[model samples]
Target: PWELTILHTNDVHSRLEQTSEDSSKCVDASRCMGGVARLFTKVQQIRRAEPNVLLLDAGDQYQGTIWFTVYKGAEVAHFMNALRYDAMALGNHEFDNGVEGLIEPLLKEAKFPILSANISASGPLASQISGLYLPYKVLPVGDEVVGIVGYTSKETPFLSNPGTNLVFEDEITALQPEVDKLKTLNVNKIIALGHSGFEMDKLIAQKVRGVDVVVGGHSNTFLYTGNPPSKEVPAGKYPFIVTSDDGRKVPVVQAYAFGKYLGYLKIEFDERGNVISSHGNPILLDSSIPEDPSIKADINKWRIKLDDYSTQELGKTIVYLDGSSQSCRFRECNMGNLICDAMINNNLRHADEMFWNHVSMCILNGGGIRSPIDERNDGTITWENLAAVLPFGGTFDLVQLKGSTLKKAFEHSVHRYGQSTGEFLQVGGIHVVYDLSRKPGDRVVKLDVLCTSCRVPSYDPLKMDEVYKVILPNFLANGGDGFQMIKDELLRHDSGDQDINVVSTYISKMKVIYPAVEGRIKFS
Candidate 1:
């Protein structure tokens, strides 16, 4: 009987520092949960305890906190190198900074094989990645030759910019050949690793031949076999078994993101490399797990680099600023209201009694907000909290458009009604009544604009010829989230204020925030 243990993590998102139970920056150390140090301690302990252990990561080791912003992918490289990760899959966020941004992290700093069979690179990355065994690697573990093949989301370009050089191929198309190559190498025990999310992983497991196990990321899905250790709802059972095309059992697994849980799976293989037994669950990184001193000490050094600005208490939030994907993407969220309010507050400058009155009718995508601003123990929300919620900082762009253009924009917003994508709008100073039951483009049943030329600023009925000056984040104004109408209709760059800076200033001025879901977006 041949057996091996696999320890894995995915969608870490640069959480080198400990986080609260909600996966936010831990204000009170006593309640601190997952972090790189805790992960280090757990992995090292597991490594020492198990005879044959393979440490793997399923990608998304970049972005989320100041760590990635300040150090780029250097922090991910440093910590992953320190932990002795055997191999990692390419996550979509790894390509967020474009193909050029990945050069230093992968080529220079990394000591492990970061893989994606589906991704074909050109230009500088082409030569650099070619040097790596890439797409797949064959490892000899416990006298058994095992193959590890990788793949990533083909939808990379829609969410992130991998640039023109990298072409993300179909998962199954990229996978079968690599598994074939591994077979040529006489490796029958195969594992598929990548960051295409859980649903995609199941497809791979079901479609691909010879692949016995799949470790995944990107959706940050939590897969657990037993009772959950935290409030996190398990998306499915750990090692969720899927039948392959040839009718072999394949295990698909993913640990929830943010360094919150470390996936642990053990497998026993028969003589022919068929998986005979598989069992395990993701270990929750809780206070019970001690932090590795060496990793924790180094993390503090990194923390010091951003501490001056990150910890500065900006204002207090009495309510839980909900920026969750489930809440903001599909429905009106409190954090969405707060962010839109700040957008309005920032643009509501100029004399003659609110000259920028119409500009107050601002709109921002709900997808831009990352994490929920969890009320700290003392009720103070710091710059770090705000930064985490709004990580991809950019300057505001002003757009003036007729109600016709606005109508097109609103229609596009609810276009993906049944789906939860980033295009959903969180508006301020404007009220929209939508009928999702109707067709996508025609779902916006009614609209009201907070009028500029009116005697008093009011949410008035829409008029096609009536022009409204609206403030937009640089992303949305520049046609992000498929807002092509706003891009075409007089998009201006008059405002030069950064989002985080403007929002911080708004908090500094307000001293506290108590925003709620104020029916800005009404549903029927």
Candidate 2:
């Protein structure tokens, strides 16, 4: 008989500092919750009590804050090394800056092995990256040999900037061979550490024969027991059980995104390496947990470099910019309107010099707005605040398409309506009414396009044969977030302006800006 304890976190996204007690905003240090300092304290306590404990992260330790903007992945590496992470999987955002970014500052500085079983870096362009990435790691915990295989989301190519050369296979297909190879090596137990989202993780657990447990991220799924303490509803029960194709019970768990929670799982395995029993829950890293003094000091030291621009005031907002994942991805959000408006405004500002004489509407995927511009007491908006909302560093791009094609794109945007999908279209120069009760492709009930060419912009019924110039983020133009309809058209070109800069410039000009959902997108 042997037992092992697994302590894990996923999608931390550079939240090294504690949030407010309610986790809605940044607060005083005394009232802060869920920082790495507090996380260290909790992990140490658990490790001291358990003789065989393993620390793992399901990936996405990069992007989201000023920390990533300045230090890139180096800061994440520093903290993960401080915490002594045993292994980590590659998240889609790990490739946000392309292959070289993940290779140098992240993989080079990481003291632990980075794994991704589905990615084949065998091509000439990706060979250097392949050297740093591993498929599986064999770990010895007391008397048992445990094999941990990693799988990154195959959607990386579309969702991030991994560039060409790196090929990603389907998660289950790639995971099975790695599991089989581990078994051939006489490894008794297998775990899948991945960033393939909660749904994919469940599918992997159900189809893959040997994987005993799946720790996942990418969808920011919160799995908990009983009622969750937070405002967010639990996606499902903690350690959700799935019956595999071979009739084996597999457990899957994902701690919610940010550094808000730490997952704990204890398992007892028989001599044959099959799990006999398992139980655990995600511990909320609230202020109730003590912060490690040294870790706090290190975090403080790192912020000295970020102090200048992170807190510099940009402008003021009278209304909240709702960038919450659920809000932005499912419906119209002020943050989305702000971003798309900035894109269109930038194009119009340079119309004469830049020869953008034909621009009309702007459409952006709600998924691009990653964080909320929370209401502040002073109503002050800072560079750091804006960076958090558009953290991916994408730029605005213009694409020309027929009204019929634009209509089709709107239909595609609502393809996954009612569920949280990134493809939901947030617009600036168009009004759309979608019906949830309608079938997927036929969800758009009404559509109107704004004519920017008119002396005073006005809404007109969309003419199917009319060609219109539309502005969008570079990511969507290249088919990110399932925007294949946009990619199918080839008249796309860059606007030569970073998306965040466009928003910043727009806000700077406005001085005092108030943006809200004005029925730009209506759902019935």
Candidate 3:
């Protein structure tokens, strides 16, 4: 009986500012446009035009910028709080700091509720996340009832924490009960705020029964409504569809990642709680927008705290780090190698004095290298270039991985080696040669740890319990990248006065660094 207009954003990352040169209407895209300022202005406009307007963000708010690096999630919380977000979904990146890191932002700083259905902390990082998340939130829009059930991707097991003590049950499995429960509440519309991405969203909408409008995240797909690339799928209208649960069709809309577009889905409902009609399309948050000065100021404040590291160059680049390249579009690239190497070098250099003769390794997930690198015509790789390469700022964590545990980690990560979505490890310290011809878990015929001279260190495979130190980001150690085995090790081992710090200390020492394919790894 009522008309409802929903404006949604999924996977904003920490892009508080707009893309500078990464914007494109069709091809040769420049990563420019979209920011908190323009978003704020849009929000203001929506409120002015419509009597009932909802502005929502669907997670990944904490990573990918100097702002997150300088203040973690603390500063962004203030900015979002100022916006008075009606409802938000949690993205996997929220767990970047473990539970302790996420707690402060939710408890004291944020002025909104993070509707995360499956996040828990029954283990080491409990105080921050457990019991704090909600399955779904119901909002009363006029006389009609609209239910919003939020869920993040269950892939957190592969991406964030293993032994998480927390559990992310399959969303469809978890959602069925929630949907049934909501049906009893006299709601007219049911909207699923799911971070499971687009393909899963389509699948879920087709199979599951109660959801009406599904706003998705995690996959970072834009509903391409124009001409597609010549070598790729021709650009057709990427409109939202409505369908049944058996792979039929269901209403679904997802704005591309990094706040590039605003997803506006207009839903019309009848008295019987069935969606009468729906229309959806992506609106580019581009230069036609005016920045909200207040939010812009907030973003500027955080940038000021980033200091020199945000501007410094890691090294010179041979080719332009083009993220749009066809080579990098699907799998691992030289850029992935370089970025992973940066993480490793930063860790080794930081722990040199603290860790005495420790067995160290740095492994970066392929997903973390969000952008590619390129040597400009000037033959310079500056801070702006690095920013483009790694727009999301992730922390460097050093964890102790026993030989046995280390073996399992390699096994777990290699499973997704060839798949486009599965994040492969860009590793250092170990010369691991796995035959691609072999089966998944058993692929490693040769695993070698290099000494100072870059020679392989002899080790024992039977010594599963022998303690050894490994360097990986906290994201992986806590199971952020599907290396849950690493989280299991955290529970078994003694932490022993370990410290995690900013990576700037390590980035400072980088000069003429080239983290690329150097025969450290091979596939027979």
Candidate 4:
């Protein structure tokens, strides 16, 4: 009716502790910014300073740190319960742990509603701990009925580990009906809280019939009203407004990920829940924001409990592990080499396995890696912090695959070339040269498979008819990232070791990881 302040966070990616300005590990909290402590302070400040306040999270509260590795979904629920979120949409990565992992976080521990209108669980996917489905929840806000309908990406199956039991529909297809149901319930004030990327978020606001505003995540777009608050350049206005076919106005907003910014959107709406005006900016939770001592105290408890894990030493790296998104997708990254080496080299221990000679190659998605392994201030990497990379917790799945199928997968891998999407391949035990001068699909000038069977283990040109054993992240094996050839009944075995453990153990074994950008993938 009058005004509503929607305060939210998106793609936090489990940065429960403070971080450096760039969202990296905080070696010194005095210089750090944007952790649950600071973020909680800002939320509390805003909630008390204003009225009609709705605290929400735009998905992806899972993954990214050792807390998630140890606690699974419980920590997400614990902290979210502490902060008292009204509702949170499920992000694609929330499924990184699969259905059983998400159960406690979504249905058991969370005091608030965890929603995604786009998917319906099959089999044991009972929406509730036992039953009932609540894709959208109606919450009270200053004498107004605010309806929040959540939706995640339809590409979730290909992006994260939702497993085969979950079915994803188009964002708009599943969302429109939810909005319709809310409208009929006389909840005129509808807010679409979801994890679809920026464009899809806008698409939802434009197409959904009764939505008044959208707070979204997944793409992790940083929007500001004016001068930038921190290092992240503003993508656009804080509340990017889109017009409807009937001349209705809808505003969409997202704060960049890792708890760096708290999105602040103040919207004035008419009695009909039509937006009259909207304005705000993402509050950069910098050092200036005082960390609530009580929250900080509570956080130290988690840290103390995780003391050994967080501070325990790992191998040292002479070179930086360059796993940045820009580096991983566009070129051969050292961190990619480091990770690929972990997956493929660790398998050497099982060289006695039947098809071990044929299983020299290991493949991981570039999108699967984020934040390069930064050197600890002490020049040593902490084992747990190092585990943050390849945070997608799953074991490597070995498969018997044909060379043609592998080539087809590489074609798609480079299809998003220069776009920096996840399909880009970070690999080991193979040499690939791409002739970018040619068309996208035919750019592979040469694909070489390492000959594990050979006494010398030389590189052999990939022969289409030849079948070989390969190691892959379960994400790709389960057909995530749209790699269906991996699923053609070619599975061989599960390595039964978490990728994080595999990578960490490799580093522990070496005591000094050799991080280098070897010429695994070439371009001419």
Which 10 consecutive residues of model 1 have the lowest summed lDDT? 349-358
Q: Per-residue lDDT of 1-524 in model 4, one digit per residue for the tens? A: 48999999988877888888767668777778888878788888888888889999988888666677667768788888888888899887787667777885655778888887878766655544333235799998877789998888786654555767677888898888888998889998999999878888888878888889999998768988878967887778879988875678889999988898888899998888888899998888888899989888988887765667767776788777888998998988998888888877655532323333545897888888877877655557776666567655455656678888899888878875787799789889989999877887898889998886665677889999888778888778867887877776453433224577667768888987767777899998
- Tens-digit lDDT track for model 3 on 393-510? 4445556667677777767656756565435666666666667677788877777664432233443332467655565654676587678778886532211101112233233455
Off by over 4 Å in 1: 123-125, 308-445, 448-524
Error of 1 at 444 (Å): 8.2
Q: What is the lDDT of residue 86 in candidate 3?
A: 73
RMSD of each: 12.1, 10.6, 11.3, 10.3
Query: Against the hidden reference, what TM-scores do the models get?
Result: 0.67, 0.69, 0.63, 0.69
Candidates in order have lDDT scores of 0.81, 0.82, 0.62, 0.79
- Mind giving the per-residue lDDT tens digits that candidate 1 earns over 313-403? 7788888889998999888898888877887775553234445343658888888989998776577888878777887745555667788
Name the top lDDT candidate. 2
Residue pairs in collision within model 2: none
Q: If both were scored by TM-score, which would come out higher, candidate 1 or candidate 2?
A: 2
Q: Which ten residues in a row have the lowest lDDT in candidate 4?
A: 349-358
Which runs of model 4 end up more than 4 angstroms from their true locations? 127-133, 310-338, 341-426, 432-502, 505-524
- Tell me the spans in candidate 2 whose CA falls farther than 4 Å from its real position: 21-24, 311-338, 341-426, 429-446, 449-524
